[PDB]
């Protein structure tokens, strides 16, 4: 069928320039119709640009028309998106969609999105600390365990549990935007309360906008 | 705001049969284009859920439905379900000035009647980690609980507390029910000079309460 993966999330000054990609696989970007629709945090959808296969040109919304250029790499199948002049109004989610261009519809495929960030402050990669299982966190036969990941910009982190191995029972939860100006949020995860002398507990902690990864060993109160 | 219009909000109980409208011009969706229906579940990317008015994708539930009228266009969902709480968007084309993919403003669903469900709640103490690099930060975890509103508050041994708290705002989980976290950040000094520090999550008119001392290591 039709996949889609996207650039990663970043953090650009204002009057600055970003530019997102979105590689396609199943089908080739030639039988596509491509499109770019943003979300600023907790409002809606904006469509920005896509190609109108009535037409075979690529339209811009009014809105961005002078600021917006969407490009294509067909040797590639992956498609471009670069948004000049950023202001605060920029920061959002943007998504590449895309229909088969033997219809009409733009969005029957969505991508991950990439947050950008239009900011003055710049990258800061998290701290990751172990949030250790101890009697305080037992419920009888499971136990709580986590991971803090403190004082990061911008958003996102996301977080798993050894590798994906543990999915049933992990809890990532929303980031607090502290009085610094940085994020932090933390990852639980339940397991059983028999396991903890002898299984390992490792919190995936991945930040984009930083390039960086941690793996960060959780192990109990001692 | 929206080219389209939308009602902000629409609810319905388990079972019942609820409709969205959206409605339009005679540029849009009176001009006879399309109109299609996106649902976006909490946490998650929109994805499509009805097309050319009123077909289904491979895999959407024949719950959902669409019709089209005039200037306006309706989402129907039938015997409603809680997993069904989500935001709807219909989309159709406009032409104005130009090719354009135009947007409603996008719908709450709210299913009611759902149970109230009482916070889990952990709270860990700083990690031993954190308070060698001379910090420390109290983490109070609170999770499937209905509804949404939550106090959180802290105490110093038995003294409320708020210099150093920071709390989120409650956030709906893939259940329908919410979470939220607080923080505390304190010095190390203060960490280890009280007996003991707590966090109370009030919800519905009930608390539960967690503690944690520095002469632990449980």
């Known amino acids: 069928q039709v996949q889609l993966v996207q650039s990663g999330a970043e953090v650009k000054k204002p009057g600055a320039s970003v530019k997102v990609s979105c590689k396609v696989s199943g089908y080739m970007l030639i039988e596509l119709s491509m499109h770019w629709v943003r979300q600023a945090p907790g409002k809606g959808l904006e469509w920005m640009g896509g190609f109108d296969p009535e037409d075979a040109e690529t339209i811009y919304a009014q809105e961005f028309q002078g600021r917006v250029t969407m490009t294509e790499d067909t040797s590639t199948d992956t498609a471009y998106m670069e948004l000049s002049s950023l202001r605060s109004e920029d920061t959002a989610v943007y998504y590449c969609t895309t229909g088969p261009a033997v219809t009409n519809r733009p969005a029957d495929y969505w991508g991950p999105g990439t947050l950008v960030t239009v900011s003055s402050a710049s990258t800061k990669g998290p701290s990751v600390f172990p949030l250790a299982p101890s009697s305080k966190s037992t419920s009888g036969g499971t136990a709580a365990l986590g991971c803090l990941v403190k004082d990061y910009f911008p958003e996102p982190v996301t977080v798993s549990w050894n590798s994906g191995a543990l999915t049933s029972g992990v809890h990532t939860f929303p980031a607090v935007l502290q009085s610094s100006g940085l994020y932090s949020l933390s990852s639980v995860v339940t397991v059983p309360s028999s396991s903890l002398g002898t299984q390992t507990y490792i919190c995936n902690v991945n930040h984009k906008p930083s390039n960086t990864k941690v793996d960060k060993r959780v192990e109990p109160k001692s | 705001q929206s080219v389209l219009t939308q009602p902000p909000s629409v609810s319905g109980a388990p079972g019942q049969r609820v409709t969205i409208s959206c409605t339009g011009s005679?540029?849009?969706?009176?001009?006879?284009?399309?109109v299609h229906w996106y649902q976006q579940l909490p946490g998650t990317a929109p994805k499509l859920l009805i097309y050319?008015?009123?077909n289904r994708p491979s895999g959407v539930p024949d719950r959902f439905s669409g019709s089209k009228s005039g200037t306006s266009a309706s989402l129907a969902i039938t015997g409603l379900q809680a997993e069904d709480e989500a935001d709807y968007y219909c989309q159709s084309y406009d032409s104005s000035l130009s090719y354009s993919v135009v947007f409603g403003g996008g719908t709450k669903l709210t299913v009611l009647g759902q149970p109230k469900a009482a916070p889990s709640v952990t709270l860990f103490p700083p990690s031993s980690e954190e308070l060698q690099a001379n910090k420390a930060t109290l983490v109070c975890l609170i999770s499937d609980f209905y509804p949404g509103a939550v106090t959180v508050a802290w105490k110093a041994d038995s003294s409320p507390v708020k210099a150093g708290v920071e709390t989120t705002t409650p956030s709906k989980q893939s259940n329908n029910k919410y979470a939220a976290s607080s923080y505390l950040s304190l010095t190390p000094e203060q960490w280890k000079s009280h007996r003991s520090y707590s966090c109370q999550v009030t919800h519905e008119g009930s608390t539960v309460e967690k503690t944690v001392a520095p002469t632990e290591c449980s």
């Open positions: 050319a008015n009123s």
């Open positions: 005679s540029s849009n969706i009176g001009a006879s284009y399309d």
